[PDB]
Amino acid sequence: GSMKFQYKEDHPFEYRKKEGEKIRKKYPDRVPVIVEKAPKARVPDLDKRKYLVPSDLTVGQFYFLIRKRIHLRPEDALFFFVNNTIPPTSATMGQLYEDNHEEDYFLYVAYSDESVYGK
Amino acid sequence: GSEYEEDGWTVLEPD
């Protein structure tokens, strides 16, 4: 739809909606977050994309969780993007998901070694 | 930071 994240284009909306409603009514204290790379950013790609983290887990913890999965080089930085807006580190993934999840009940987060937009 | 793959997912714990 938005032609930005690849997970929306590789799977139909009906399967993504029923996957979100299934994982929500099963694990209520966690949020589904799809993590994907930025357009042609100089950063390794994350083969694992579906991430189920707890709601009260903060964005700061999510930065450490994802950066370990990427095996990122120590020189680069990591910037997340929730609706092309660098999310507040002092916020929780449950509040971001509550305010930014799409119609398929999924929070989409993109990472990049450079701030595309946010600050 | 606990790894956990169930039903095609990555349930990363606070540990």
Numbering used by the authors:
A (entry chain A): -1 to 117
B (entry chain B): 1 to 15
Describing publication, verbatim:
Here we introduce RFpeptides, a denoising diffusion-based pipeline for designing macrocyclic binders against protein targets of interest. We tested 20 or fewer designed macrocycles against each of four diverse proteins and obtained binders with medium to high affinity against all targets. RFpeptides is not limited to generating macrocycles with particular motifs or topologies; the diffusion process generates macrocycles with diverse shapes and sizes and selects the topologies appropriate for the protein being targeted. Among the four targets tested here, binders for MCL1 and MDM2 have helical motifs, binders for GABARAP have a β-sheet topology and binders for RbtA sample looplike conformations that make extensive contacts with the flat surface of this target.
We selected γ-aminobutyric acid type A receptor-associated (GABARAP) as the target, a protein responsible for mediating autophagy through its role in autophagosome biogenesis and recruitment of cargo, resulting in lysosomal degradation of damaged or surplus proteins and organelles. Two designs, GAB_D8 and GAB_D23, showed binding affinities of 6 nM and 36 nM, respectively. To our knowledge, GAB_D8 is the most potent macrocyclic GABARAP binder to date. We instead crystallized GAB_D8 bound to GABARAPL1, a homolog of GABARAP with 86% overall sequence identity and 100% sequence identity for residues within 5 Å of GAB_D8 in the design model. The X-ray crystal structure for GAB_D8 bound to GABARAPL1 matched very closely with the design model, with a Cα r.m.s.d. of 1.2 Å over the macrocycle when aligned by the target protein to the closest of the four copies in the asymmetric unit and a Cα r.m.s.d. of 0.47 Å when aligned by macrocycle alone. Notably, the X-ray structure of the GAB_D8–GABARAPL1 complex showed two different bound conformations of GAB_D8, one that closely matched the design model and a second one that partially deviated from the design model, with a register shift nucleated by Thr10 from the macrocycle forming main-chain-mediated and side-chain-mediated hydrogen bonds with Lys48 on the target. While our original design models were predicted with single sequences as inputs to AF2, we retrospectively predicted the GAB_D8–GABARAPL1 and GAB_D23–GABARAP complex structures with multiple-sequence alignment (MSA) inputs.
